[PDB]
């Protein structure tokens, strides 16, 4: 406790917003590319949704990984 | 810089068009039904009078409205890309004004369309005593021409084979232009045009049986030299023999007309597959090669229902 | 002969017009329902429930007496313009707008500036923070006058309260689009829609019930088979439409939910940006000096009236911008649009 | 809270930041391509203001994981 | 032990100023492609506003947790 | 003695991240701006607006920079 | 622990979130190219998929390391 | 005590200099468009000077902070 | 069992672990995007494109290594 | 001085470091322009000069700042 | 021992760590230009292999320090 | 003796390699530039050189904070 | 003699890797350029060799320099 | 002493690291329109290897420095 808590919510923290950070890093070009291809045809919505929520596994592995810190904590 | 800034107004300009419908609605008229069509299009907006001239200056009009400002609208980098895209019309005016030089007609006498340089400038370079002063005086800061007929005015001031020196000098220019710069997209529909055009002067050429290396450039990779050989000598078993490129229906076409429609469908299928990179450039690129096929084809068909011509007449290009 | 038939049911009424039946209440939220397009021939439009909330949430939004003050004062102004009877044309914005669309925009602009007020009352605040110097709310630091709802400097009550509000509103905003969503899948025979809106409903009840267990308090023995009947619910419906519309579409869903607690936080932000500029001023007015007051007091005054411009705009916009979101995709508002009522003019 | 609540509070605050930033690197590209495609028809734009709302569920796991490090606090 | 304050302030500028950054980095690419599309018609540029204006929820979360930090200080 | 210098070293960099953001906006939009002024000087004020439109954060900044100064 | 638990627990976060940002960073530009060809045809929508499931080589990495540190935390 | 008055230079330091380097991303673009906008034109100077000087204030904003901690200490 | 050393060379087992997951990232980013270029051109050069996707994972490899001859003598 | 000098020397350093990043990223760009502008013509060769140069203003304002905190070290 | 040990381990890390960064930075182009090169034709297999094998050597210095720092562990 | 030596080291060194980075991040687009104008023509080599040498004046202002950081210790 | 050996080798790891990092920043560009002028033309890989082997220079005065850490420790 | 020590060695690794990372970074783009140039003409190969060579200046200073750190421990 303490410098062990506090640590503990450094290191998830970072772990947390590093992996929102690539998740949005992934999603920038991935609703980009999606816009554009649903301003050629808006037909292909579904696989261009499935595109775009393609980068969400790493954001719910960093949830998983702090409510692993937060249970050791 | 702004690949999406102008993209925005590029993606509205090509929301706005006639569909095909618009055609086969005119395939059925004779030049008042297609004067009112072409009325109610965009080039109703430059629609001035009445004739075969006079819609050919409200389709002019309506392209150089339409795709004229994507000269502007970027700097720098995009810029530079934009300004190698439509380098037909301004290389004409530059030839145009070349012939006029070297020929003894008046710069008045030309016509000199719109390309990428102003009235002013090529009014300044086509009098003008040196050739490296003309394209100096002609010097637009991202003209690859610019950088060109001054590579190459270091052979005479205005002949001929300075001159087929100098269009090969603005090719290689473009190519490595092209080359030079992050265009995964554009440096591959640059050296398709450049490929098309050894192989339409070749096509056109079928049958001159001169030297095919003088004649083939560097950066094709659809043929080598010794298809270019066998293609230069009276024989379409090269041109059998793209098989897998970009050429999918042309083999066995001889003919310079069937071999440069070949060519046309198969750069318009190349330039219309731009649109995989939407953010960048070539969703503009797919828009201009789709302006132009259709204003090319509305240019053919005002004339087909301004003499009357048959659907079997028009059949060849409205493929296209 | 005229066969004056109905229109088709809602299995295909795509050709057939539409056109909004609101009351005149109702009136003006058509004009901000004109932003979205037409409905589907058998949707609900939810133009008056969006005069509900959004001036509901514009008015927890919005609780500056000062900047409800400036409203209504625009209003007048507003209302002397449509006096005048004019169509407002500003050459600057280079438009010429009807003078309905003009009473309209001031009947809506009362409309919710008495939400504004009641929740600045509510708030305590009036022109910013008029309490520092006569404490006319009641705090029990400076105790001058009857107490107020919301602290608005104190928040260590009033932050678990506000964000239990603000899921409180998207959760019922959730269910209520949820819920239509089921019954135009039943109105319209689309099982499809219904089941996938019965899913919904039960994976987000699950969900909620979940979270609210684990992360929340003790005692889950209320809610385990909450959860175990929620997830239940979420798989037997999922088998009963068998698409692959994964936890991907629970998690949007999920999300645009929570996203009202963002309405919480920008009324906060506003307030509290808007209190210590007024805090300051009046520090450096009459704290420093009691003397320059008037020109400290107008510095003061200029910097809130350039930070309004500033934010209250996107302020009020964001409410209605995650209604947009909320309310109109929650009963889809992205199905063909339908077709528009366009009759014969006769503009005279 | 001597090394705990003086560190719980900057992990989660780095991990705000991050989110934030991540969720902005998504907006950038997200928004210039719906500005791109509105500006192609003010038709598609249902569809245009979905994807540009899709990209918050970084920002929200980010401000959750503040709640909970307040409530561990 | 009167260094949590100021690592909790320092952690809540850490927070402050990444999220400005994410939201400056959003706001780069929509008011660029908000201006080209304004400068082209003058028609939709409340449009454009609006999509400019929707990235300030990142900035307003950003300053509710730096508040949430100041009454935890 | 700790708690009085590390609140001015988090709100100096909460002030200077701030400044990049709102620098790293102001670069697209002056770029945009200027060509639109380039391309016209008919178009200033709505570029003038969407330039000053950039000027939020480094306000929440300041306030955020006072309220520290308050604080420490 | 208090001082040695607190440094592996940052280290194991920080390797999680550097490792989600580089996933990221790849899946930005694989889910433009994905977009782009399913634009194209729906044909190598397996092809696409399968490139797109190729970026979580270095994740299931981190994941085995976050297991390996939580068994030695 | 030490490591305060050292701290708040520090982050003044880091205001100034990170303020400065927004400013100069800032000046980047502007000085491009604006040689651009002078080489098409140099009768625009005056205008594309003052969008160039605009973005001044943050280090404006930096130097009147770093004022402050000096006045401060 | 360090009091401090303990932790400190898990923590940059994991800084090393992670920056080589970003690199093979950055490579394998430009590498896919070049690759799905090219198997959308002819989808026959399936085997070189792999062999180049897969080039990128030796720092990756390099680094799991290096973690774990740092988790065995930490 | 104790440690507090060499604090006062690492936040000037850190200062007088990112005001030389943020002058050289201002410089980037404008000699690029500036080349580019040369090799159109000479005529505009002050003129580009000047707009190179006026990048070391916040390089001024940072020597400034630290003939100030050398003054206070 | 106190704490030497792993500080010496932790700068080995961030030695291999960034010259593995430094390693695909290079070979992100280089691979991108060599698969454009052998999309173009496959006779290039001998050479564009050869310009990929050839930023190994970075890596290779990298994790000869790291074993100089392991055998100084 | 006192770490403020260490201390003053390490700002030293942020200040050279911030500086270095600086003046690199301003030469790449400048050397870029003056090697294609170069390429051009070597007519306005004179000024291009003189485009190139103007990026040391950073390098030049943090030599002469190193020194006066090397002479204060 | 606390943690000098290990902050020593902290500070040599941290010049390796972003010593390795700038060279393989330069090696980018350079590979691509390279590459491209090996498929424009193959006698053209020796200088396309030398200007990949042109930007190791930092690689071995970083090699340099952590030989002369080891040397000074 | 044994803190001092190590701290002066972690300044040199940021003082060479970081001025190789700048160093590099000039070296990308320069070397980039140096190869260009080359494969377009393989006559201006001494201007190109003399803009090649023409930003070491900054590592220099950056060597000149460290030796200086060397010779000061």
């Known amino acids: 406790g303490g410098l062990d808590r506090g640590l503990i919510a450094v290191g998830m923290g970072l772990a947390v917003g590093l992996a929102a950070l690539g998740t949005g890093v992934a999603q920038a070009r991935i609703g980009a590319a999606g816009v554009g291809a649903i301003a050629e045809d808006r037909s292909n919505f579904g696989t261009a949704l499935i595109f775009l929520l393609l980068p969400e596994t790493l954001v719910i592995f960093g949830l998983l990984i702090a409510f692993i810190l937060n249970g050791r904590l | ?320 | 002969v005229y066969a004056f038939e109905p229109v088709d049911e809602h299995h295909e009424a795509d050709r057939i017009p539409v056109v909004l039946d609101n009351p005149p209440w109702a009136k003006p939220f058509e004009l901000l329902v004109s932003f979205l397009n037409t409905p589907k021939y058998g949707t609900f439009d939810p133009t008056p429930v969006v005069p509900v909330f959004f001036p509901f949430w514009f008015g927890m939004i919005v609780g500056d007496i000062g900047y409800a003050l400036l409203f209504y004062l625009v209003g007048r102004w507003l209302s002397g313009y449509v006096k005048r009877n004019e169509p407002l044309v500003i050459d600057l914005f280079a438009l010429k707008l009807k003078p309905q669309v003009i009473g309209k925009l001031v009947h809506i602009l009362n409309w919710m500036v008495f939400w504004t007020v009641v929740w600045g009352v509510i708030y305590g605040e009036f022109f910013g923070t008029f309490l520092e110097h006569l404490g006319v709310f009641g705090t029990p630091e400076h105790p001058g006058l009857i107490p107020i709802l919301i602290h608005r400097i104190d928040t260590a009550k009033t932050a678990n309260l506000l964000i239990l509000l603000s899921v409180a509103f998207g959760v019922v905003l959730v269910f209520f689009g949820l819920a239509l969503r089921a019954y135009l899948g039943l109105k319209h025979r689309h099982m499809a829609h219904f089941w996938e809106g019965v899913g919904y409903l039960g994976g987000l009840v699950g969900v909620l019930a979940l979270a609210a267990s684990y992360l929340g308090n003790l005692q889950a023995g209320w809610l385990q088979g909450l959860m175990y009947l929620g997830f239940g619910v979420f798989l037997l419906a999922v088998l009963m439409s068998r698409i692959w519309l994964m936890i991907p579409e629970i998690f949007t869903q999920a999300g645009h939910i929570l996203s009202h607690i963002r309405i919480y936080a920008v009324g906060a932000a506003g307030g509290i940006l808007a209190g210590l500029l007024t805090d300051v001023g009046f520090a450096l007015a009459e704290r420093l000096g009691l003397l320059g007051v008037l020109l400290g007091l107008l510095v003061a005054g200029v910097l809130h009236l350039l930070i309004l411009l500033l934010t209250t705009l996107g302020h009020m916009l964001q409410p209605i911008r995650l209604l947009w979101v909320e309310f109109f995709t929650k009963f889809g508002f992205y199905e063909e649009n339908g077709r528009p009522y366009r009759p014969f003019k006769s503009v005279r």
Chains 1, 4, 5, 7, 8, 10, 11, 12, 13, 14 share one sequence.
């Not at chain 2, 700097?75 to 012939?99: I, K, P």
């Not at chain 2, 001929?160 to 220019?173: H, Q, S």
């Not at chain 2, 090269?238 to 070949?262: H, I, M, Q, Y």
Request: hydrophobic share 45%; aromatic share 8%.
């Open chain 2, 1 to 320: 810089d702004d690949f999406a800034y102008l993209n925005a107004r590029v993606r509205v300009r090509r929301g706005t068009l006639l569909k095909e419908s618009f055609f086969q609605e005119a395939l059925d008229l004779s030049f008042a039904d297609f004067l009112r069509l072409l009325s109610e299009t965009v080039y109703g907006g430059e629609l001035a009078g009445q004739g075969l001239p006079d819609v050919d200056r409200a389709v002019l009009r309506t392209q150089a409205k339409l795709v004229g400002d994507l000269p502007r609208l970027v700097t720098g980098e995009a810029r530079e890309a934009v300004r190698l895209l439509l380098l037909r019309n301004d290389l004409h005016n530059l030839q145009a004004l070349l012939r006029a030089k070297a020929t003894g007609r008046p710069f008045e006498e030309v016509l000199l369309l719109p390309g990428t340089l102003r009235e002013e400038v090529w009014r300044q370079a086509y009098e003008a005593q040196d050739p490296a002063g003309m394209a100096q005086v002609l010097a637009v800061p991202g003209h690859p021409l610019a950088r060109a007929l001054r590579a190459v005015l270091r052979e005479t001031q205005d002949l001929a084979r300075v001159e087929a020196l100098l269009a090969k000098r603005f090719f290689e220019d473009v190519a490595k232009a092209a080359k030079g710069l992050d265009q995964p997209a554009l440096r591959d529909y640059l050296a398709l045009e450049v490929d098309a055009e050894n192989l339409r002067t070749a096509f056109k050429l079928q049958g001159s049986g001169l030297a095919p290396d003088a004649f083939f450039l560097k950066g094709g990779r659809f043929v080598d030299r010794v298809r270019f050989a066998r293609l230069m000598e009276g024989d379409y078993a090269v041109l059998d023999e793209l098989s897998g490129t970009p050429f999918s229906g042309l083999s066995g076409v001889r003919d310079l007309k069937a071999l440069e429609r070949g060519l046309r469908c198969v750069l318009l299928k190349e330039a219309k597959k731009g649109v995989q990179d939407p953010l960048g450039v070539g969703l503009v690129l797919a828009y201009v090669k789709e302006r132009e096929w259709e204003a090319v084809r509305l240019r053919l068909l005002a004339r087909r229902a301004y003499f009357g011509l048959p659907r079997a007449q028009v059949e060849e290009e409205v493929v296209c």
